[PDB]
Amino acid sequence: GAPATVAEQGEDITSKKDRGVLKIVKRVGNGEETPMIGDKVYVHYKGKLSNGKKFDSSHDRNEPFVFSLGKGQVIKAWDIGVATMKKGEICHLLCKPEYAYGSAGSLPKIPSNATLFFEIELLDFKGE
């Protein structure tokens, strides 16, 4: 499924080139700009464990998730991945534990050393 597709096909967007955050663009955005670090970003997401099991989606609550880009308010993979996105873009990210919840995980939903999948839509972004 999607998580296995990005493991097999995803672009490595670390920095360290450690395959810790892999990306596929699924829908191309409509703007040419990404958000800048510090920008307020508004996203919809659907998260799955590596094996396809859904753990959460903002669409259920019909409530965009908001954060300040690149400020450590969310797991590392999101700060890195959302920074690569254009407004209106939908991407898939696959995130190794080092760029997510690590050895502790976030039980009950997320086990230790979990590689997580996200489908993320960048709805909007605003200045700092």
The conformation of residue 31, written as its DSSP 8-state character, comes to: S
Cβ contact 113:99 at 8 Å: no
At how many Å resolution was this determined?
2.0
Domain span at residue 23 reads 1-128
* Joined tokens for residue 113: 């050393």
Q: How was this structure determined?
A: X-ray
Cβ contact 110:118 at 8 Å: no
CATH number, domain of 11, equals: 3.10.50.40
- Rounded to whole angstroms, the Cα distance separating 90 from 128 reads 22
3-state secondary structure of 19: coil
Cross-strand partners of 124 = 42
Structural domain count of the chain? 1
* Joined tokens for residue 108: 């009950």
Active site residues: 45, 55-56, 75, 101, 118
The number of C-alpha atoms within 13 Å of 13 and in the hemisphere containing its C-beta is 26
**Residues comprising the chain, all counted:** 128
